Symmetry: C2
Subunit: 212 residues, 2 copies
């Protein structure tokens, strides 16, 4: 009955302040009320309604309510699979959020499948050094490693690192981050010498930049 | 030597993805490198440089490095006290972030003093239901309660709740949130009947909205 239920997106910022202050339960309570109000007034495909369901699921995760987050994000992702193109940023966003919830729930195969889609699509829509594109690649590598696909994590990160070698300066935070992720993959793969070699290289560059 | 060090603000999003995935250490490492690069190239008053120091301090907090966050935010707040007006949103933002770090460090009096300034200024610049304005009021009340100023927390929240009674519908998430915060204050103040009365009222409205 409230005039503009879509404007309850303002409550997302308040939820984040609660979470930052450790009041993760209060953030869940806040957004459960948002979601209940919008459920009475907005259609299931409404982007504002889906947005607040996404934020509530993130709040559930912060409050340790992993199963509740998985179930809610499954609903969001299912709706957006019908209403939005694969290339839609909101669709991609809820896909990697559900993958994160799946990982926390030990549902590794389901996370891998989602992140393969996100990485494939972002390879078209985003530049190689975009933070979301890089983050999804790192997340896919970690999902692979938890799924008995360590070799595929190594192949993925070696490609990321090779591309950065041609595009970013050696001191760039993202270049160092991917090399660190690759070192972790090498370790999991039994390539322990190469891992400690790579980690020493990263540490040397960090030291030279931060403690010149 | 990198051409556009100010554009390293892109790394803030990558840090947030790391944090969400539990990699809070990696987020600190990422932003320490950003801050070191910008320190070599940007003046101390540069808004991009201050922005990344603010984000690094937030990363320190997420990684449990409370003292490091306090020291970094003290630097940021000191610089912005000279370079920015009290009404500048960035100045306000780092003030309530430092107050949060102070609370985590048991420096309650210092947090109260900062949050009194933030609340006083936001009372002029923001509408009463703006999420940041409300969040700072709730944070000030909690700081007061930890500082032996419980009565002042009650006075503050009673005013917030009274204003919302005239501006927001009873089911509004923010109206319920402030009533919950007020109930906590009443409890701390020994007004235990009024607290349980108010909490029952909130719970009744939540139930009617969420489980009609």
């Amino acid at each position: 009955h409230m005039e503009h239920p879509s404007r309850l997106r303002s409550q997302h910022e308040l939820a984040r302040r609660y979470q930052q202050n450790g009041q993760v339960q209060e953030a869940v309570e806040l957004l459960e009320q948002v979601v209940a109000i919008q459920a009475k007034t907005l259609r299931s495909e409404h982007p504002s309604r889906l947005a607040s369901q996404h934020e509530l699921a993130r709040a559930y995760m912060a409050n340790g309510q992993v199963q509740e987050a998985v179930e809610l994000l499954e609903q969001v992702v299912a709706i957006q699979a019908k209403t939005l193109r694969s290339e839609h940023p909101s669709r991609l966003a809820s896909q990697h959020e559900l993958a994160r919830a799946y990982m926390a729930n030990g549902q590794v195969q389901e996370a891998v499948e989602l992140l393969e889609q996100v990485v494939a699509i972002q390879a078209k829509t985003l530049r190689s050094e975009h933070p979301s594109r890089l983050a999804s690649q790192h997340e896919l590598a970690r999902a692979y490693m938890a799924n008995g696909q360590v070799q595929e994590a190594v192949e993925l990160l070696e490609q990321v690192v090779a591309i950065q070698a041609k595009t970013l300066r050696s001191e760039h935070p993202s270049r160092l981050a991917s090399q660190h992720e690759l070192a972790r993959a090498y370790q999991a793969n039994g390539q322990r010498q190469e891992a400690q070699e790579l980690l020493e290289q990263v540490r040397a560059i960090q030291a030279k930049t931060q403690r010149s």
